[PDB]
Amino acid sequence: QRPELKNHIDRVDAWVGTYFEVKIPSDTFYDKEDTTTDKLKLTLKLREQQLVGEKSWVQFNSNSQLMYGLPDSSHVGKHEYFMHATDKGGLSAVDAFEIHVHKRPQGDKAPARFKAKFVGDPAPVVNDIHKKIALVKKLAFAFGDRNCSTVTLQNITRG
Amino acid sequence: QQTTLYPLVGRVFVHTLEPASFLHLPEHAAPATIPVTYHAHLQGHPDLPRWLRYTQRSPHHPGFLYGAATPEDRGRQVIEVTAYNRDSFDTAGQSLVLLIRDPEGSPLP
Amino acid sequence: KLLFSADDNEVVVGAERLRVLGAEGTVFPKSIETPNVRADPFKELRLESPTRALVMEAPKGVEINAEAGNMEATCRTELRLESKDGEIKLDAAKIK
Amino acid sequence: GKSLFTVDEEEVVVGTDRLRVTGPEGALFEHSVETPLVTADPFQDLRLESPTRSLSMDAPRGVHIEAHAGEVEALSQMDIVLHSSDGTLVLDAETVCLPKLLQGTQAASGSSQGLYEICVCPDGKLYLSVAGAGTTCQEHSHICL
Amino acid sequence: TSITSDIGMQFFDPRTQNILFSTDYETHEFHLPSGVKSLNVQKASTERITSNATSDLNIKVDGRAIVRGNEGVFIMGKTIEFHMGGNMELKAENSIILNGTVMVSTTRLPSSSSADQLGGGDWVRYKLCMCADGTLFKVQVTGQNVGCQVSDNPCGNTH
Ligand SMILES: *[C@@H]1O[C@H](CO)[C@@H](O[C@@H]2O[C@H](CO)[C@@H](O[C@@H]3O[C@H](CO)[C@@H](O)[C@H](O)[C@@H]3O)[C@H](O)[C@H]2NC(C)=O)[C@H](O)[C@H]1NC(C)=O
Ligand SMILES: *[C@@H]1O[C@H](CO)[C@@H](O[C@@H]2O[C@H](CO)[C@@H](O[C@@H]3O[C@H](CO)[C@@H](O)[C@H](O)[C@@H]3O)[C@H](O)[C@H]2NC(C)=O)[C@H](O)[C@H]1NC(C)=O
Ligand SMILES: *[C@@H]1O[C@H](CO)[C@@H](O[C@@H]2O[C@H](CO)[C@@H](O[C@@H]3O[C@H](CO)[C@@H](O)[C@H](O)[C@@H]3O)[C@H](O)[C@H]2NC(C)=O)[C@H](O)[C@H]1NC(C)=O
Ligand SMILES: *[C@@H]1O[C@H](CO)[C@@H](O[C@@H]2O[C@H](CO)[C@@H](O[C@@H]3O[C@H](CO)[C@@H](O)[C@H](O)[C@@H]3O)[C@H](O)[C@H]2NC(C)=O)[C@H](O)[C@H]1NC(C)=O
Ligand SMILES: *[C@@H]1O[C@H](CO)[C@@H](O)[C@H](O)[C@H]1NC(C)=O
């Protein structure tokens, strides 16, 4: 049978330069043949049923059933996405959700401002969101931190 | 057609609603078959006040107007309510008169 | 930048946002002119009349789009599809 | 001497007929809004989006969608239900285009039962007749009245 | 009666020391005044639009009306009309469903008269036929006695 839906995702709150990660709730979708979300295939899609690109600032892993991302100020504001829940029966249930990306609330008056210059071209690092999230989690691990969202990159300049 | 009710501050108020006399068009044979919803609002307003709310499981089930009177809403209150039959599309305007007054007797701390 | 004016036609207030309180609603006896009506997040949108008819017009087109949903045109008398000089098509894999 | 805008400790009276707020953020109406008319400024589109939930259009007297000089566009990603409960469905157009029908192969053998053909009453009433080797609309003219 | 400053107008009743009106909008939140006939706001977040019990709502616009239902639209009414000037387009992905006792405008739709002696003789034209499960399918006509019986069912086998 076609899977059914009970709870929606209202909206996702994100901030520019901050890494967010959301695990889908276990009661998000239901099917008479499956009864659980984890035993059912979950995908993320755009308005006309196109997946997120590799270079997009938000990605989502199906096996870890985990969405994640880090937005930029050129993508501040609203955005829309669809969650598609496909069972073994080849039938898809659909939910929609909206993501609000805000500017950094502290803004310009931060009491601390860390600055560092590295080696090599920043073009592949900026062009790759994978490199960006690896960098953020690597700073977080360098401080020994768990929640990598505590890093807020503010600006990168080619030198 | 109007009806006057007497709510009091402190406890709940609930009004079971029956389409037999609420609707100007009688429902003969088995009246429980016909599905009718109800939309209740303050007169000249789109919605009930904060203290009052409305629910309905299914259109084939009676609706319910319910809420707890507040001391800040004491006095005379007017409810304009429309019986929207889910099938018969029949408009039945109705007025309810509420007199929110103080409770009588010992309080309930 | 103009932050207040009050002349013989109208009063312009240049506030960043308009924020009304009260859950009972509001009454605007004449009209609302809004270029974009958007639903509240996590909330429905409803365009209904309590006891009367609803008429809506757009001389340059109407797009009803259900990007993931249905078009449940529930009537009881007539689903009139009256085109002056155009045509009707049912673009779907199956027709029931 | 006509009042135009007044303030005091009691209220803020606006005696004019328009109140424009230019802020790019916009209004925030925390519940439903009563009005007999909604529109926009001239030569400006209006979008009624429901970005995260569904939408309904309900009228006890009827809904009349009009585009007198334009077109009605209705595409949906899912099934579309033209559910006339027990009423009629008049489709008034010069041309009806059905380019996405399944193609059938005529043969003497019958795959199964329940096969019918579409038949038209002279008044526009549409019905069905039992499918056969030839046409059977003419044999089943009882329903037409 | 113009005024000009960096901050702007102000007024507070000295008998309350409350700023009854100001124009530094970031500080004091604006509220809706009383007695307003119309308001023309460039963006509205409306839960519901409704009329009063006497007259009709009119969603009238010189521009185009784009109503989009992310989880779907439901039109409920007694007499439901669609008066378009040009073409009417009804597009679906899975299927269309026309449930009801359908009529048609016989005068408006053209009818092929038999005055011509088989001008479209032995021509590739299709006949609409009714499946058991409500589906419709077109069968090409070869001779004068082509019915709706098929062997290779495009309706699918009637499982
Ligand atoms: C931003 O700077 C703050 C420094 O204030 C970083 O937060 C700090 O994180 C460490 C964990 O790596 C906290 O250490 C604590 O140690 C005590 C010792 O008993 C233990 O009880 C705690 O459970 C924790 O392990 C430290 O307190 C905390 N500082 C706070 C909360 O003020 C933060 O990671 C930095 N974010 C970045 C660099 O993105
Ligand atoms: C963060 O990095 C950005 C980009 O490296 C810096 O913004 C840049 O600021 C310079 C200085 O004004 C801009 O140069 C000139 O800008 C004007 C317009 O303001 C333009 O007409 C000139 O042709 C020239 O490009 C540069 O455009 C601008 N880059 C942008 C906006 O992308 C910014 O200063 C850095 N901030 C911090 C805190 O490090
Ligand atoms: C009975 O239970 C209902 C539901 O919990 C109570 O109604 C709630 O009352 C609170 C406070 O009176 C309301 O909170 C207010 O919300 C507004 C926004 O609408 C906010 O601006 C205020 O600052 C305040 O936080 C709440 O909205 C309201 N909820 C509903 C659904 O009406 C009611 O008070 C309870 N009555 C008794 C006697 O216990
Ligand atoms: C329910 O909504 C209807 C539709 O707007 C209201 O009827 C209209 O009410 C307005 C304001 O009360 C009337 O405007 C004024 O009317 C007087 C005489 O009626 C006229 O001399 C003025 O120049 C001005 O136009 C409008 O005429 C009236 N229209 C009709 C057809 O009745 C009605 O008042 C609303 N009722 C409630 C209880 O909200
Ligand atoms: C990590 O930081 C976030 C701030 O976005 C906070 O919500 C979360 O609780 C932190 N993690 C832990 C383990 O406290």
Beta bridge partners of A7: none
> What's chain C's Rg over C-alpha atoms?
20
Contact list, A94 vs chain C (CB under 8 Å)? 68
What ligand is nearest to the CA atom of residue A145? Answer: 1
Q: How many other CB atoms are there within 10 angstroms of residue E1's CB atom?
A: 3
Tell me the residue type at B24: H
Picking from A47, E74, E95, the residue whose alpha carbon sits closest to that of residue D79 is: E95
Place of tokens 């039109």: E75
Tokens of A113: 């401002």
| Residue count (chain E) | 159
Q: Hey, what are E98's tokens?
A: 């026309």
Which residue, D98, D126, D101, is CA-closest to E139?
A: D101
CA distance B49 to B54: 11
Based on C-alpha coordinates, what's the Rg of chain A? 18
Q: Judge whether C13 and E30 are in contact, CB under 8 Å.
A: yes
Resolved by: cryo-EM
Return the CA Rg of chain D.
27
Contact D21, E25 (CB under 8 A): no
Tell if the CB–CB gap between B44 and E52 is shorter than 8 Å: yes
Nearest to B48 by CA among B36, B35, B38, B34: B38
Spatial distance between the Cα atoms of B55 and B40, rounded to a whole number of angstroms: 10
Are E140 and E124 in contact by the 8 Å Cβ rule? The answer is yes
List of long-range contacts for B14-20, beta carbons under 8 Å, 24+ apart: B14/B64, B14/B65, B14/B66, B15/B64, B15/B65, B15/B66, B15/B96, B16/B62, B16/B64, B17/B62, B17/B63, B17/B64, B17/B65, B18/B62, B19/B83
Give, as one character, the DSSP assignment of residue D139: G
Q: What angle do CA D96, D98, D101 make, to 5 degrees?
A: 160
- Of A31, A15, A13, the C-alpha closest to C42 is A13
Residues of C in contact with E34 (CB under 8 A): none
Ligand nearest to the CA of A115: 2
Give the ligand whose atoms come closest to the C-alpha of residue A149.
5
Contact A74, A115 (CB under 8 A): no
d(CA A87, CA D61): 43
A143 C-alpha to center of ligand 1: Å?
8
D18: amino acid identity, one letter: R
Judging contacts by C-beta atoms under 8 Å, the chain D residues touching residue A8 are 52-53
CA-derived radius of gyration, chain E = 31
Handedness of CA B21, B22, B27, B29 (dihedral sign): negative
In the structure, do chain A and chain C come into contact, i.e. share 3 or more CB pairs under 8 Å?
yes
Kind plus residue range of the DSSP H or E element containing E139: strand E136-141
Using a CB-CB distance cutoff of 8 angstroms, which residues of chain C are in contact with residue D54? 44-45, 69
- Site to substitute for ligand 4 among E54, E56, E57, E58, most atoms within 8 A of C-beta: E54
C-alpha E40/C-alpha C37 separation (Å) is 12
Rounded-to-integer distance, Cα B24 and Cα B91, Å: 9
Is E46 exposed, middle or buried, given 0-12, 13-18 or 19+ CB atoms closer than 10 A? buried
Show Cβ contacts of residue B55 under 8 Å, excluding neighbours closer than 6 positions. B63, B64, B66
Q: What is the DSSP letter of E148?
A: S
Dihedral angle at the C-alpha atoms of B100, B101, B103, B109, nearest 10 degrees?
Answer: 60
Which of these, A115, A114, A128, A121, lies nearest to A159 by C-alpha position? A121
Pairwise CA distance, residues A115 & B99, whole Å: 68
Distances (CA, A) of A68 to A14, A18, A83, A104, D95: 10, 11, 14, 18, 50
Structure tokens at B83: 């019986």
Sign (positive/negative) of CA torsion A55, A59, A61, A62?
negative
Tokens of A15: 């901030």
Residue A138's φ and ψ, nearest 5 degrees, are: -75, -40
Of B32, B23, B18, nearest to B1 by C-alpha is B23
The answer to whether E78 faces chain B, any CB pair under 8 Å, is: yes
Q: Residue E129's closest CA among E139, E144, E120?
A: E139
D25, C14 contact by CB (below 8 A): no
Pairing of strands C4-6, D88-89: unpaired
Element containing residue C46 per DSSP (H, E): strand C45-48
DSSP result, E22-80:
ES-TTTSPP-PPBS--EEEES-EE-SEEE--SSS-EEEE-SS-EEEEESS-EEEEESEE
The beta-carbon neighbor of C24 closest among B47, B82, B91 is: B47
CA proximity to D12, closest of E30, E70, E42: E30
DSSP string covering A51-75, please?
PPPTTSSEEEETTTTEEEE---GGG
DSSP-assigned letter for residue B87: T
Q: Half-sphere exposure of residue C10, counting CA atoms within 13 Å on the CB side? A: 12
CB contact under 8 A, C42 and A8: yes
Q: Quick one: CA dihedral D128, D130, D136, D140, positive or negative?
A: negative
| Residues forming beta bridges with residue B84, ordered by sequence position | B37
For residue D43, is it left (φ>0), alpha (ψ between -120 and 50) or beta? left
Give B7-59 as a 3 state SS string. CEECCEEEEECCHHHHCCCCCCCCHHHCCEEEEEEECCCCCCCCCEEEECCCC
Residue D75, H or E segment: strand D72-76
DSSP character at residue A149: G
Whether residue E49 contacts residue C54, with contact meaning beta carbons closer than 8 Å, is answered with no
Element (DSSP H or E) covering residue A139: helix A129-142
Element (H, E) at A123: helix A122-127
Enumerate the β-bridge partners of residue D127.
D119
Q: What distance in Å separates the CA atoms of residue C24 and residue D33, rounded to the nearest whole number?
A: 9
D124 with D89: CB under 8 angstroms? no
Contact yes or no for E74/D55 (Cβ under 8 A): yes
The number of residues making up chain C comes to: 96
CA torsion angle B37 B42 B48 B50 (round to 10): -170
Please calculate the CA angle A53-A59-A62 and round it to the nearest 5 degrees.
110
CA dihedral A121, A126, A132, A135 (to 10 degrees): 30
Helix, strand, coil percentages in chain C from 3-state DSSP, rounded to 5: 0, 50, 50
Return the H-helix or E-strand segment holding B85: strand B75-85
